[PDB]
Design a protein around this ligand. Structure first.
Ligand SMILES: Cc1cc2nc3c(=O)[nH]c(=O)nc-3n(C[C@H](O)[C@H](O)[C@H](O)COP(=O)(O)OP(=O)(O)OC[C@H]3O[C@@H](n4cnc5c(N)ncnc54)[C@H](O)[C@@H]3O)c2cc1C
Ligand SMILES: C[C@H]1CCN2C[C@]34Cc5c([nH]c6c7c(ccc56)OC(C)(C)C=C7)C(C)(C)[C@@H]3C[C@]12C(=O)N4
Length: 444
């Protein structure tokens, strides 16, 4: 009477959620990660209510208590024009009915990493996983260490949560499709809180932040800028979507030129005010990340049903929209629930059930987000003032953030099993009926 043996490749946000979900539900987990995931890198990650619904269950509420300093307290989004005038206050009252988090990525990683070690996930860092294989009875990978040693590692199935540049994707989709550039990029960073404090010209940014997180949006010709705070003003973060036709690589490590941001904003009346804050970004923390459009894959599960791509390995989203991490956490929760309902003798059924629950929903978020940064609702600001028309409603969509993916999986498991095994199409109701046919989403 043994436990299911789960191999996880990659401990970004989704791999760590997968590890915690699987272990909490009684399965044995060996996770593999090639780098030191604890180094501070990136800026802030947003988690909406569909993700925090899931996180709240971890450790009878332990991870939620650890994340409590990061609960979003913004009551509205304040939308401004290039003079800095406040045009519209968009109410966040229903979006914030249930908890949302905003926090540096590395602090999220740390909290999940420590919880995973506490509940008995086995973690191997400094391990590049490659050469996965599978049959009707099990799966294995090669664990390659930095000294060149190879170790074969066997388990019941492999979770590929190895990010947008996934090398495991080959094992499922042989020929790779290249994402299409949108012609837009995003400047983004954390601000150095210590030098931001002590600059009088930037003092305005702290007003109110101890009771209501800042969430200011600024629409300039050629730049859409958002400035947010969190944890009572201990962290400030900003981003700026601008036009960029350069051949930029989509990684989080390359140095950008801060003067490119400055030149873009200083020519409008509100530029000096915004720069008084943004100037306190550390020089080697300026990221300029291209917003690429990834087409949904044809499927996520391998031929023998023992490998599944889940997070950005399955459905990369640009940081522009705000559902990337949240959707990946739903992947881990639906998969772990599916594996629990199906049992150890029905692993391939478990993976195929989870893919059919998640595919159309995740593809719809992915396809809508294309129209957000490759197109968008950006008008001539010489003639129009910004308003809610110009705020990508994706994080404000109740059918995304109100969803309870574990409840759905439990209520629908047997109907999905029936479709898998009878070879019928499963029409999931965890997205709007009109949406699937409108976006051209074909069922797996
Ligand atoms: C360093 C870094 C910084 C980021 N910063 C931000 C940010 O500031 N804001 C934001 O919105 N998003 C950021 N992201 C992206 C964000 O993590 C994802 O968009 C999403 O939230 C979760 O995706 P994921 O967990 O599927 O993949 P990722 O977060 O990309 O995690 C993938 C992980 O897999 C590991 N890996 C890859 N190949 C292998 C292999 N063969 N063997 C073992 N391990 C492997 C990588 O080292 C990485 O740790 C960052 C990602 C990275 C990697
Ligand atoms: C391009 C930029 C210009 C301005 N931005 C606003 C946005 C809406 C939004 C975001 N995050 C949100 C959150 C939210 C409600 C709405 C949003 O609730 C909380 C709980 C506060 C957490 C995150 C962004 C990802 C930053 C997108 C992207 C963007 C936009 O159009 N719409």
């Amino acid at each position: 009477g043994e436990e299911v043996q789960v191999i996880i490749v990659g401990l970004g946000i989704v791999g760590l959620a997968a590890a915690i979900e699987c272990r909490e539900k009684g399965h044995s987990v060996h996770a593999f990660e090639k780098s030191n995931i604890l180094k501070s890198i990136g800026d802030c990650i947003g988690l909406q209510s569909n993700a925090t619904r899931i996180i709240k269950r971890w450790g009878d509420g332990a991870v939620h208590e650890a994340l409590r300093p990061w609960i979003v307290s913004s009551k509205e989004i304040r939308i401004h024009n290039s003079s800095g005038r406040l045009i519209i206050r968009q109410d966040l009252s229903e979006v914030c009915e249930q908890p949302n988090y905003l926090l540096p990525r590395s602090e999220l990683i740390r909290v999940m990493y420590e919880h995973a070690l506490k509940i008995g996930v086995e973690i191997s860092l400094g391990v590049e996983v490659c050469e996965p294989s599978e049959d009707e009875e099990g799966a294995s990978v090669v664990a390659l260490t930095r000294d060149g040693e190879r170790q074969i590692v066997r388990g019941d199935f492999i979770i590929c949560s190895d990010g947008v540049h996934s090398k495991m994707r080959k094992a499922i989709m042989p020929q790779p499709v290249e994402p299409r550039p949108s012609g837009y990029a995003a400047f983004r960073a954390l601000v150095d809180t210590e030098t931001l404090k002590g600059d009088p010209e930037a003092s305005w940014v702290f007003e109110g932040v101890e009771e209501n997180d800042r969430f200011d949006v600024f629409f300039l010709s050629g730049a859409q800028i958002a400035l947010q705070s969190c944890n009572k003003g201990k962290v400030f973060s900003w981003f700026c979507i601008h036009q960029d036709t350069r051949n930029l690589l989509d990684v989080w490590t390359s140095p950008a030129d801060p003067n490119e941001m400055l030149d873009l904003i200083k020519v409008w009346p509100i530029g000096q005010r915004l720069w008084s804050v943004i100037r306190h970004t550390q020089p080697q923390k300026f990221i300029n990340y291209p917003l690429l459009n990834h087409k949904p894959l044809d499927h996520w599960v391998s031929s023998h049903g023992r490998l599944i791509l889940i997070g950005d390995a399955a459905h990369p989203l640009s940081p522009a929209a705000g559902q990337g991490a949240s959707q990946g956490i739903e992947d881990a929760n639906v998969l772990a629930t599916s594996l629990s309902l199906a049992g150890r003798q029905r692993v391939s059924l478990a993976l195929h059930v989870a893919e059919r629950i998640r595919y159309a929903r995740a593809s719809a978020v992915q396809l809508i987000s294309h129209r957000v940064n490759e197109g968008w609702r950006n008008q001539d600001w010489d003639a129009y003032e910004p308003n809610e028309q110009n705020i990508a409603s994706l994080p404000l969509e109740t059918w995304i953030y109100g969803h309870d993916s574990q409840a759905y999986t439990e209520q629908e498991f047997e109907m999905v099993v029936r479709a898998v095994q009878e070879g019928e199409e499963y029409h999931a109701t965890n997205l709007p009926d009109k949406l699937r046919v409108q976006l051209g989403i074909r069922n797996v």
